[PDB]
Design a protein around this nucleic acid. Structure first.
Length: 80
DNA sequence: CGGGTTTTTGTTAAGGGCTGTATCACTGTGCGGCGCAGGCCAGATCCAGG
């Protein structure tokens, strides 16, 4: 991670200086969207669907109201 | 042999937020029996006052 800062510590400046001009400065989703379109150019369409399902909390993860319904409706105590 | 040189990886501390684990007084499994509690009411049942 520290060397992924050391190798991208100029392109990181490029993406934060383009983020404020193109949309306004939203640093997460612009590189997310570049990663989606990079999978499009790399031609994986199911993998990007798993990506957006994760980033909507669907393909795994289990949004915590559903886990609450599972912990409640099967008589599971909190320790179990 | 090792200065140079490019990068890897770390530390520095002020804040923040997510996740992990300790802490607190308590549980239950240590034993058996039974119709019974509460309340209401008609039918005996006793008790002294003549």
């Amino acid at each position: 991670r520290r060397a992924q800062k050391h190798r991208l510590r100029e392109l990181k400046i490029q993406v934060k200086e383009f983020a404020d001009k193109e949309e306004g400065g939203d640093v997460k989703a612009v590189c997310l969207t570049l990663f989606l379109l990079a999978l499009r150019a790399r031609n994986e369409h199911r993998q990007a669907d798993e990506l957006e399902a994760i980033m909507q909390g669907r393909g795994s993860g289990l949004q915590p109201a559903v886990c609450l319904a599972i912990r409640v409706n099967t008589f599971l105590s909190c320790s179990q």
